[PDB]
Design an enzyme around this catalytic site. Sequence first.
Site, PDB file in Angstrom:
ATOM      1  N   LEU A  63     117.830 -41.943  80.114  1.00 11.62           N
ATOM      2  CA  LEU A  63     116.458 -41.445  80.996  1.00 11.62           C
ATOM      3  C   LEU A  63     115.824 -42.092  81.424  1.00 11.62           C
ATOM      4  O   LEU A  63     116.370 -43.228  81.803  1.00 11.62           O
ATOM      5  CB  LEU A  63     115.106 -41.710  79.405  1.00 11.62           C
ATOM      6  CG  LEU A  63     115.478 -40.384  78.683  1.00 11.62           C
ATOM      7  CD1 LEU A  63     115.176 -40.987  77.396  1.00 11.62           C
ATOM      8  CD2 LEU A  63     115.526 -39.088  79.393  1.00 11.62           C
ATOM      9  N   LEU A 112     120.442 -42.201  76.285  1.00 10.78           N
ATOM     10  CA  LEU A 112     121.002 -40.426  75.978  1.00 10.78           C
ATOM     11  C   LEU A 112     121.876 -40.195  76.920  1.00 10.78           C
ATOM     12  O   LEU A 112     122.300 -39.281  76.359  1.00 10.78           O
ATOM     13  CB  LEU A 112     118.814 -39.803  76.120  1.00 10.78           C
ATOM     14  CG  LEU A 112     119.487 -38.183  76.541  1.00 10.78           C
ATOM     15  CD1 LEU A 112     119.627 -37.769  74.928  1.00 10.78           C
ATOM     16  CD2 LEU A 112     118.238 -37.778  77.622  1.00 10.78           C
ATOM     17  N   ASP A 143     117.490 -40.809  69.604  1.00  8.30           N
ATOM     18  CA  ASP A 143     117.871 -39.455  70.212  1.00  8.30           C
ATOM     19  C   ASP A 143     118.845 -38.915  70.179  1.00  8.30           C
ATOM     20  O   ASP A 143     119.897 -39.304  70.014  1.00  8.30           O
ATOM     21  CB  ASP A 143     117.089 -39.496  71.297  1.00  8.30           C
ATOM     22  CG  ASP A 143     117.419 -41.015  72.568  1.00  8.30           C
ATOM     23  OD1 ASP A 143     118.824 -40.565  72.712  1.00  8.30           O
ATOM     24  OD2 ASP A 143     117.102 -41.190  73.712  1.00  8.30           O
TER      25      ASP A 143
END
Lengths: 250, 251, 250
Positions: A63, A112, A143
Amino acid sequence: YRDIVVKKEDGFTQIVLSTRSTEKNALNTEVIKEIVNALNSAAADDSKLVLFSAAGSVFCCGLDFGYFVKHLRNNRNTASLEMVDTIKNFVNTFIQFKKPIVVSVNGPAIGLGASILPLCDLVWANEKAWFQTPYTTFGQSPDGCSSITFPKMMGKASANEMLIAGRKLTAREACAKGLVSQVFLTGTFTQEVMIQIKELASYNPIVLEECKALVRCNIKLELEQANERECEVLRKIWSSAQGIESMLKI
Amino acid sequence: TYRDIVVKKEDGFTQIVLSTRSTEKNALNTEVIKEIVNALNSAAADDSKLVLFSAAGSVFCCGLDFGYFVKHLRNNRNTASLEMVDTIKNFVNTFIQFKKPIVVSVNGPAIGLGASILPLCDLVWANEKAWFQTPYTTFGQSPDGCSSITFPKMMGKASANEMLIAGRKLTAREACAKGLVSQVFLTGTFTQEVMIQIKELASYNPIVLEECKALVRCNIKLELEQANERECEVLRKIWSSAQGIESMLKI
Amino acid sequence: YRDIVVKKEDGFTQIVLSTRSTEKNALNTEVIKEIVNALNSAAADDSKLVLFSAAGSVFCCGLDFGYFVKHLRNNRNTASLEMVDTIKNFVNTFIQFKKPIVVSVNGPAIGLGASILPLCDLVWANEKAWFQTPYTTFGQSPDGCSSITFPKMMGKASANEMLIAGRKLTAREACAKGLVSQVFLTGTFTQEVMIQIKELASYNPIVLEECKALVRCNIKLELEQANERECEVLRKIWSSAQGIESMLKI
Ligand SMILES: [Cl-]
Ligand SMILES: [Cl-]
Ligand SMILES: [Cl-]
């Protein structure tokens, strides 16, 4: 596409991460949406499998926090809710995808960037690649379904050395842990990958999908549920004073 | 005040040192189990971000003190097994319910119940000279500490059974390759390296720590409670039988 | 019999695969029906555990497809149902078995010869043994519950290196992945298996039956449903024209 290159070859389609709207292949909303759209088209393709790779010195630093933090700073729960929604749908696209995805990692995979790997079917890494999920440093909870997929692969306590302690894994270390499934020599890396992918593309399409569907079968629901749980916690953290403060730290 | 353990409330963490005086090699008896449960309960309540769980002496924990237990069992088998099984079940359940991360530091052998509780913690830091063993088949018992499911989960069932059935010993490095240990440390810098790594962990956000743990245990916490119940019912059956007492007397 | 030897020793029964009807301990309907009979018998024995071993250069090269492709050629609808039914019952025999099964692997284990291993309790392999499930070259979906057991034991990506990529694992790398549970030095392999097995057979019967019951209860139902789903997919592949075209390659 501005941020990825999609090449539909003999029996497979290459999706190449190669961002220009961001640095080090970071994921902003628009990069994620191109990936989702490229994956959706490969799903409708007559490709047998997808090769997922990257260009540049980094595979994916995950991200793009500089990008998200700016949005989060006109307020509020809104930007928070949108960003989680984007992450939720990104992870789900991988969860639902029916054709094998082979991932080729030729540089660091972070956050991520690393946590979507176990959502793929094969992970082929240059011996020089490394992997990290610096969540406690970022100030977030896991995540990409990593709260279940890391413990399933490597056991709870080894999962936690990545989830809690934020440790980097070399390619060889990540492979003994199940996160990488095969390590390649740097000098001959990209040709080694293409030869092995063309071999995989030469097999029967029905047996490739049926094998994935049979491995997929019991695990899919669990992953959907992990993603939902992960996203609910991120909503809470990223709309707290504390969570926002953390994301602001570089 | 504690007889058999030392508790240190440190900078953002609680430290629980197994250091028994009423048993040898940090063996667990009823009284040692209750102090640990108690210490955990207090650490749950105070503002510690995490617990460092460690030991003093040349062994981490040699598990249950069978000399201590076989004496009570010899007196009234029906009644003493219910007691034994209740305290072990509740010992295990305390680790299952604990919401804060537990880092365990192992600086010598971890045997039987002393190894089987490790998978219920969050990180397992071992000195290179530590070893791990669950000699249940030698003791004459079935698995305890939820190992009947936690060992197959981390290792696969066959590798699990080398420890559960075959009674094999794992060095720290090979326990690390099997997921039981999560970090191995050189013996020369063991406790100082552990102490730096623990203080950096204690520097992290409490909500992030606890949410992450909650997410990881979510789909398994029920399974653990159920394993512990199943395990302890078989243990109750074995420890109330003539063969079970006899097996225990030969340890 | 014909293709196996049953040896009933002090507290354990040994079943030895030494096929004359097939080459390299491959499985046909006759070899499989003998194994099933031996197993069912052993289950009724006073033996505390089973040692499963084999004689010859290979442990088990899996299904004899030169045998099977034959009977599938003429009656292409019902020969598949027959083949899949035999396989499903063979696998179910392992799933259901209540005493420990130790398997001793003294040479290559290939295809269904490899995928039944996770169904047993301990897998002792000679350092020279190797392991392979080359389904995608066979042109088939996984068998023996490998669709769930390989992913569970080694992670999904590592599992697909076997399931999809048809990769060979040495005894040592199969041990690092959870498939073998102990590697033996070759010069004393035989001696060492017999010693360790008599060791195990000297343990209390109640405690052996119970550790197996405690391990088995959480996972048996899942194993039965994987078997069902795998067999269904094989029904389809092996009755199709491309399936039969696949089955023809030695
Ligand atoms: Cl670049
Ligand atoms: Cl001491
Ligand atoms: Cl031969």
